[PDB]
Symmetry: C2
């Protein structure tokens, strides 16, 4: 089912019913924005896979390259083109836009500012709510950068939701907003970030994938905040066979993450064995993508 | 003396001391911004006269035509060039600049906004300081639109004083600010306004100038908020001969406005005589300008 395919593994969909109605149009666009990253990791990949879900539903995909660090990009500029290679290599075909800031720019920005109120604008800020005028204007500038220029759907992590909630109030365009979960990093602290070695870059070698996974936070029986279980949920295909030592009961067949979840919850699956599986499966899954470097 | 000629009839000079230093420079420029106006009246003329004072001291004069009603392209630009002909007719030859909206534009505002704070921004507002986000951003946008791009001196009315003092806090280069008084309108309420019949337009006919001055607010003995006294101060030459019937004391010669101020304040000069002198002198003064109509 196309709707269910889009919903699978999302945190929320503003206007579910709205999304359905969007699906009926022949021509339909989705955007997502990524701040360019020196490394593309599983966090990025989780999103692209969602864009790919939409692509498969006949969405025209738009990827906005987000430099709002305009406060150099002769340097940022093809970290962008590189990311582009990676998204192409993950099998995503889309049209690219970047920060550019044409003449009509300040006009609509101010028009949005006419509508938002200081109380409203403050609600919209991240948690260093506490003030410079830049901090109050910024979110309206972010709302403007949303590629709503004819898109029916906008996608992003749950961390963007405050802004997304604003954009829905402010835009002449009612846009469906789609949130992906955020991956926990390997060390079990915050979100997967290309810092703390808690990331898996989609281009890591087998040796490295194994190494990083071996060190990762994975408490036995525990599923919340378990990054190895997250990787299992978001990336792997089922049924899945887990190879194991005889002292731990030999090969184990899971037909779904739900079946796997209970098996770990009851400590029928040890972390050592779960990590070993996720490593090998992940390797197989990134390997075709990694191979798109001649 | 160059400094004293500049100071004459100004309400204030930020850094009288700083202005002295500027006068010593070999090359110096000065700007003013005007909202394009259908009618050019004595309020405009008072400023233009002050720019001419600066021009005579070896300043290059720059006039910015200020369209910040961008929230049309066509209507605004030509009302401007008609104004331009009027300033030329007043004997001002200057360099003109118009509202644009650059690539660098929003970048420059935001740097300003970074530095400005909510409380400060509020202080700078008209007193519907009391709120949409546009209200808070507006001041920074005005600041940016002070063409300070390389001027030593900026000029404007006292109504602009809140923003000019903010601009002094915020701009990278300290610009000297010079403020001209606000002319009271003919009916004696607010500033001279091209409406309510309380203006004298630079191209008004003798009969019209006479009519408007005849009905103008001028209580005997009273100097504050007396628009007729103001016109006498800012526009007339002394010694000034006031024509009168012999029955009303005959012709009268006043050597300075101060002498004239005391004459009126002690009711030794009648309003009806004062209006007639201001009207008749004003006509002689404006006639050459009026006639520069192609």
């Amino acid at each position: 089912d196309e709707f269910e395919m889009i919903k699978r593994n999302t945190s929320e969909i503003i206007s579910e019913e709205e999304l359905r109605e969007v699906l009926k149009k022949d021509e339909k666009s989705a955007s997502i924005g990524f701040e360019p990253s020196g490394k593309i990791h599983l966090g990025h990949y989780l999103q692209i896979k969602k864009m790919i879900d939409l692509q498969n539903a006949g969405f025209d995909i738009i990827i906005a390259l987000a430099d709002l660090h305009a406060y150099e990009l002769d340097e940022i500029r093809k970290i962008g083109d590189y990311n582009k290679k990676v998204f192409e290599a993950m099998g995503l075909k889309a049209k690219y836009v970047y920060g550019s800031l044409d003449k009509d720019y300040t006009l609509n920005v101010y028009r949005l500012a006419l509508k938002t109120t200081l109380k409203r604008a403050r609600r919209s800020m991240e948690l260093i709510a506490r003030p410079k005028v830049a901090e109050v204007i910024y979110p309206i500038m972010q709302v403007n950068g949303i590629h709503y220029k004819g898109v029916d759907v906008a996608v992003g992590g749950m961390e963007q939701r405050k802004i997304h909630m604003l954009a829905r109030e402010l835009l002449p365009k009612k846009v469906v907003c789609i949130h992906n979960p955020v991956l926990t990093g390997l060390d079990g602290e915050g979100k997967m970030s290309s810092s703390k070695g808690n990331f898996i870059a989609v281009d890591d070698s087998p040796e490295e994938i194994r190494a990083k996974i071996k060190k990762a936070y994975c408490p036995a029986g525990v599923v919340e905040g378990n990054p190895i279980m997250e990787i299992a949920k978001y990336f792997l295909e089922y049924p899945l066979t887990i190879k194991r030592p005889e002292k731990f009961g030999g090969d184990l067949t899971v037909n779904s993450y739900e079946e796997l979840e209970s098996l770990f919850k009851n400590k029928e699956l040890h972390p050592m064995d779960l990590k070993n599986a996720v490593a090998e499966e992940l390797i197989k899954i990134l390997e075709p993508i990694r191979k798109r470097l001649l």
